[PDB]
Design a protein around this ligand. Structure first.
Ligand SMILES: Nc1ncnc2c1c(C#CCNC(=O)COCCO)cn2[C@H]1C[C@H](O)[C@@H](COP(=O)(O)OP(=O)(O)OP(=O)(O)O)O1
Ligand SMILES: [Mg+2]
Ligand SMILES: [Mg+2]
Ligand SMILES: [Mn+2]
Length: 757
DNA sequence: AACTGTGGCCGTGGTC
DNA sequence: GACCACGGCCAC
């Protein structure tokens, strides 16, 4: 299989490198013949002789057109012949493309900003990660000496650990009496030893947890101090550290640096993404954390080093175990997009969609539309109406079924052929007309994007059917994550239509999709209420909760299955209403906030404070105990006692202050905030002390006793000292606990006054 | 992480 | 007090 491709320049000419593993052997294939290009649409074929003469300059190098060939293409499905303009070197294209577009004989140009190595994979029909090849994998981690106030990597690496199918080991330069610890003379020899190990094992995949932003940058700084050529690459190169967005990413050439952190972060929803949290969520086993402060004290005092080495060994071990499960999931996605695992595992959803569409467009002889310029971008900044959200029938309900459309927005795109190459096309035999907004879509031929969603959706449902039949609960989660990733990808094609930077931008398409969605869900609600006697309790976009007032569970389930047969026979094309589940009881608070319990006793909660990273644990813990007392024990008096116990404890300063921490993300430069909430107030006091506040910084603060603005008396939890600081017990009662639980216990006749003291 | 999309709750600190 | 805009995170 193909692992990666890139290009190097040799005597001014590009050379593609294809990193392969075949029959257990690593190979590098070199292609010297592939040429960069873009397309020009000319006013007349005779003008090509002029265009061939246009020249540019880049760094004292004259740029010329190497050669041309005329080709038949389609633009949004309409045939058109264009000139493929070839060049000697990819950098020629940025240097000359404006001069060609400016030529009076040139109407427009296309596909002039495609990275060369990806262009090669598309045009050659090559797909990374295809085949039965078994890849060898190696995880690694590091332990460092840390002191507050120091620069990054001023202190040495203390241990380097690595794990694979054969076990886990730790390299260190102090004497630790553990069988898996290899003792070397110095930090320098420890790094050189790890390098030796990577070259001996020759792994196809290096697995880290956040190596993109910590491990490799730390190693590089230390290797710069120590004079080490850290040649982990299979071509003898050192790791290649590149900016990517607001952070960095690291390649190791000829292998795949698989950083688990970007994958996990976008696949699993956790409050924190410490390695220990991730391990426990995936495998159901605890992992102990040893903190930087303990590690430094152990190294300097020479005591309890065995515990640090064990912690370091366990980091590599669980990092290997995780990579073994998540690599095949991301390899599948890599095959579906047609790009390397390295790119796909780190890329925004927009880039995944666009790379997929560029390959498919090449397969179908379709020219890609261009990315918008600044002025077109400003023109694309109007919003449009979305899904319908019904105001819920508040309170406790029994014997609830949940019905929900299968992949609704993609199914609408498929069924009604919603696409910019079909929008208001004239002269067709058949049209579908979007409700409310009136846009017409021709049905005589499959639209570009509609024609591609079907395979995604059919793949997803195969995974879903296997998921629901999987005994192994770990394997079941992993299938869940796969089918969810395809779901979001498919839905992102709809969002792509309304994305201002999209090449296949079409706002008419996007608002037609949502308009159809609104008409389908309200029609479905009308039918189930009118013709089957249901009451719809709550509905959001494409699903709803409903019951038959006064009927038992068996009756509600039976009549819901009858309604599904009836409604699906009336729905056109790929539109299908699904049975998602039955809940013995449910409590609906507001739009987007409710909790249901199934017949096995499992509670599911949506939108409520329990699921929000930005509410205090004491409020979430209390709300969770209350929901359990209500939905599971049907015990209202108990839920009330729980609240009363909590408020009393808070009043008496008996709640641990850890449960009172509030977490809120900084999303922008501090200068750009118009409204200064508590987390920005704290952030501005830290910045004034020299702390590097950037977008993505989480502020973790606690509210101290006082009266005025909350931000005036919020401090970071780092600075909280229980001997000097009294937390604001009234704030956590009146601003956190009570609001969270009173919105629920109102339904049973309890005012806040009934829950205080 | 997200810049694939819109809808929505709710705390906060302002206005009057 | 009533009201509003901002900003975060969440449900689709
Ligand atoms: N990321 C998105 N980008 C653009 N549009 C999006 C989404 C998005 C989502 C999500 C992920 N959340 C979950 O998976 C569950 O997490 C809940 C935890 O609180 C929903 N929509 C739109 C299009 C979609 O057809 C419609 C109905 O939604 P929804 O029935 O769930 O999906 P669906 O009908 O396609 O798929 P299924 O029913 O699963 O078959 O809303
Ligand atoms: Mg839904
Ligand atoms: Mg908003
Ligand atoms: Mn759905």
């Amino acid at each position: 299989m193909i692992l990666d491709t890139d290009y190097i320049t040799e005597d001014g000419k590009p050379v593609i490198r294809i990193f392969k593993k075949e029959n257990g052997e690593f190979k590098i294939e070199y292609d010297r013949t592939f040429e960069p290009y873009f397309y020009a649409l000319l006013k007349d074929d005779s003008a090509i002789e002029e265009v061939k003469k246009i020249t540019a300059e880049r760094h004292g190098t004259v740029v010329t057109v190497k050669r041309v060939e005329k080709v038949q293409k389609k633009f949004l499905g309409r045939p058109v012949e264009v000139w493929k303009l070839y060049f000697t070197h990819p950098q020629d294209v940025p240097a000359i493309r404006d001069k060609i577009r400016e030529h009076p004989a040139v109407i427009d140009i296309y596909e002039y900003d495609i990275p060369f190595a990806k262009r090669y994979l598309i045009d050659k029909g090559l797909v990374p990660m295809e085949g039965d090849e078994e890849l060898k994998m190696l995880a690694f981690a590091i332990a460092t000496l840390y002191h507050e106030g120091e620069e990054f990597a001023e202190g040495p690496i203390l241990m380097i650990s690595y794990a694979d199918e054969e076990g886990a080991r730790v390299i260190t330069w102090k004497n630790v009496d553990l069988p898996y610890v290899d003792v070397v003379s110095t930090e320098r020899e420890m790094i050189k030893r790890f390098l030796r190990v990577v070259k001996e094992k020759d792994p196809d995949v290096l697995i880290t947890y956040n190596g993109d932003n910590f491990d490799f940058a730390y190693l590089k700084k230390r290797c710069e101090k120590l004079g080490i050529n850290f040649a982990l690459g299979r071509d003898g190169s050192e790791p290649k550290i590149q900016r990517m967005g607001d952070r960095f990413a690291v390649e190791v050439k000829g292998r795949i640096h698989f950083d688990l952190y970007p994958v996990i972060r976008r696949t699993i929803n956790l409050p924190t993404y410490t390695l220990e949290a991730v391990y426990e969520a995936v495998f159901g086993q605890p992992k102990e954390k040893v903190y930087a402060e303990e590690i430094t004290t152990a190294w300097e005092t020479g005591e309890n080093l065995e515990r640090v080495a064990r912690y370091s060994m366990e980091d590599a071990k669980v990092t290997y175990e995780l990579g073994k499960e998540f690599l095949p999931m991301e390899a599948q996605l890599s095959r579906l997009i047609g790009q390397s695992l390295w790119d796909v595992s780190r890329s925004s959803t927009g880039n995944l969609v666009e790379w997929f569409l560029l390959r498919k467009a090449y397969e179908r002889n379709e020219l890609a539309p261009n990315k918008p310029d600044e002025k077109e971008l400003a023109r694309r900044r109007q919003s449009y109406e979305g899904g319908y959200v019904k105001e819920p029938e508040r309170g406790l309900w029994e014997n609830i079924v949940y019905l929900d459309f299968r992949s609704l927005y993609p199914s609408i795109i498929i069924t009604h052929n919603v696409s910019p190459d079909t929008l208001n096309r004239e002269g067709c035999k058949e049209y579908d007309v979007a409700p409310q907004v009136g846009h017409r879509f021709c049905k005589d031929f499959p639209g570009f994007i509609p024609s591609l969603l079907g395979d995604l959706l059919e793949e997803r449902q195969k995974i879903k059917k296997k998921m629901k039949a999987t005994i192994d609960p770990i394997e079941r989660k992993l299938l869940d994550y796969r089918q969810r990733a395809i779901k979001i990808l498919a839905n992102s094609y709809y969002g792509y239509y309304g994305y201002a930077r999209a090449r296949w931008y079409c706002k008419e398409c996007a608002e037609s999709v949502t308009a159809w969605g609104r008409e389908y869900i309200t029609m479905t609600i009308k039918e189930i209420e009118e013709k089957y006697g249901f009451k719809v309790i709550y509905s959001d976009t494409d699903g709803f909760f409903a019951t038959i007032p006064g009927a038992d569970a068996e009756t509600v389930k039976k009549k819901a299955m009858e309604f599904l047969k009836y409604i699906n026979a009336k729905l056109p094309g790929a539109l299908e209403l699904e049975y998602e589940g039955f809940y013995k009881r449910g409590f609906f608070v507001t739009k987007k906030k409710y909790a249901v319990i199934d017949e096995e006793g499992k509670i599911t909660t949506r939108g409520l404070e329990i699921v929000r990273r930005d509410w205090s644990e004491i409020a979430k813990e209390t709300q969770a105990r209350v929901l359990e007392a209500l939905l599971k024990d049907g015990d209202v008096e108990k839920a009330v006692r729980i609240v009363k116990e909590v408020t009393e404890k808070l009043s008496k300063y008996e709640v641990p202050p850890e449960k009172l921490v509030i977490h809120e993300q900084i999303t922008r430069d501090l200068k750009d905030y118009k409204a200064t909430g508590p987390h920005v107030a704290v952030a501005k006091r830290l910045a004034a002390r020299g702390v590097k506040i950037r977008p993505g910084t989480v502020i973790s603060y606690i509210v101290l006793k006082g009266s005025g603005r909350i931000g005036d008396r919020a401090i970071p939890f780092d600075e909280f000292d229980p001997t000097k600081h009294k937390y604001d017990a009234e704030y956590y009662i009146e601003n956190q606990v009570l609001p969270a639980v009173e919105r629920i216990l109102r339904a049973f006749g309890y005012r806040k006054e009934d829950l205080r003291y």
